[PDB]
């Protein structure tokens, strides 16, 4: 079979990959690395008016996650950005101009969900690139489907990316997994080739 | 022995489980998922008046963790809620009404502790369910002991949960592991069967 040394090697390398943001690819949409949401170019946030923050017994305001959370690595149930219905979009100014080669979308696992369902997850989606920051018409980079029966983190590689570069990318959600009120986005990542 | 494919399979599944909040069970006490502490129904917080926050050289206030931290997934030394002495309690409004089937309690590991001791950890505890939100007398669901010599995360399954459902649960700490001043609670989780 396998030697003990081979087992240690397999385990070490699997934990290395796990530690590298799970997938081992630089994320040009990570906010701490220099990416940001373009607030006016995102869907309206679905607000429930339920999470009330108070201080000294004084009600202050209701807390809802803004689109910024999709560019942050804190994926736990409820740490997601929600928009109303099954169609929505977010636009991100990447940390650098890149040739985009892949995107990653993740959702919470079924095992951490009541009744093992994730109907608020995005389903069909499309990625668009915008040449400059204030331009109206994007270029389609690819169309993909987040599989509710797949792994929580799903990476999608473009079949044949052109040589075009972009610093502005749109995540366009076309359908969801059936939730009748909203769609929840946990984390979106963009991968590719920077200047060198 | 085992094949290389079998090793990869074992490793993959262990990392899957690790990624699912370590234990692969939905947590109805997680604050981001919709749970909250009932502040007036918790022990007084032990305050040390040591962690002083300042701005522009102006002392502002002392920082202590409130009971909310036991419903958050950020377990590192000192990220715990403390009450005075070895007896205390916290009451949580769960995110949904459930038939409770298990609870999880975790503490920091001995390996991350000075002198390899965790004397502030809870020891004997009891779980109570409350039928409605403002009701005086809880129903005992079970009594358990957090083992200081066990794994940091310990899940306890009720032997024979009734069909009763609850949205309010009390964690009642009866003893600690010997700390003479306080008991520290890092994270408490509640698992069970929601409506479907």
């Amino acid at each position: 079979g396998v030697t003990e040394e081979q087992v240690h090697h397999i385990v070490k390398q699997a934990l290395q990959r796990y530690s590298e943001d799970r997938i081992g690819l630089a994320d040009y949409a990570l906010e701490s690395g220099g990416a940001s949401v373009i607030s006016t170019r995102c869907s309206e946030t679905y607000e429930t008016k339920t999470a009330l923050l108070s201080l000294f017994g004084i009600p202050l305001w209701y807390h809802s996650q803004s689109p910024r959370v999709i560019l942050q690595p804190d994926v736990h149930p409820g740490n997601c950005w929600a928009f109303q219905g099954p169609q929505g979009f977010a636009v991100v100014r990447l940390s650098a101009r890149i040739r985009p080669t892949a995107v990653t979308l993740e959702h919470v696992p079924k095992a951490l969900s009541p009744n093992s369902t994730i109907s608020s997850a995005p389903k069909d989606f499309a990625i668009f690139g915008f040449d400059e920051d204030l331009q109206q018409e994007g270029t389609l980079l690819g169309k993909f489907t987040y599989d509710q029966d797949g792994e929580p983190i799903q990476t999608f590689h473009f079949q044949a990316p052109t040589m075009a570069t972009y610093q502005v990318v749109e995540l366009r959600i076309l359908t969801n997994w059936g939730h009748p009120e909203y769609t929840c986005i946990y984390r979106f990542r963009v991968h590719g080739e920077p200047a060198h | 022995g085992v094949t290389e494919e079998q090793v990869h399979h074992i490793v993959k599944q262990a990392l899957q489980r690790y990624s699912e909040d370590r234990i692969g069970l939905a947590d109805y006490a997680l604050e981001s998922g919709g749970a909250s502490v009932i502040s007036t129904r918790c022990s007084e917080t032990y305050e040390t008046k040591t962690a002083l926050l300042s701005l522009f050289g102006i002392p502002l206030w002392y920082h202590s963790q409130s009971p909310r931290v036991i419903l958050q997934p950020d377990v590192h030394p000192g990220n715990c809620w403390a009450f005075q002495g070895p007896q205390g309690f916290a009451v949580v409004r769960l995110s949904a009404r459930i038939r409770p089937t298990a609870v999880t309690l975790e503490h920091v590991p001995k390996a991350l502790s000075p002198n390899s001791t965790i004397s502030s950890a809870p020891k004997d505890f009891a779980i109570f369910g409350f039928d409605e939100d403002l009701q005086q007398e809880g129903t005992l669901l079970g009594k358990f002991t957090y083992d200081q010599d066990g794994e940091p995360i310990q899940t306890f399954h009720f032997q024979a949960p009734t069909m009763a459902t609850y949205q309010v649960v009390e964690l009642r700490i009866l003893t600690n592991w010997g700390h003479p001043e306080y008991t520290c609670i890092y994270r408490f989780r509640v698992h069970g069967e929601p409506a479907h």
Binding site: Y46, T48, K49, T50, A51, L52, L53, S54, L55, F56, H63, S64, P77, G78, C80, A82, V108, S113, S120, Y182, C184 | E31, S32, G33, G34, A35, S36, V37, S39, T45, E47, W61, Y62, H63, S64, S66, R68, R93, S95, A96
Partner: peptide, 17 residues
């Protein structure tokens, strides 16, 4: 002054998940 604590209560059901 007194140690402040931001309290979070859910008053209108579940947040989006």
């Amino acid at each position: 002054p007194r140690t402040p604590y931001l309290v979070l209560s859910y008053v209108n059901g579940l947040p989006p998940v």
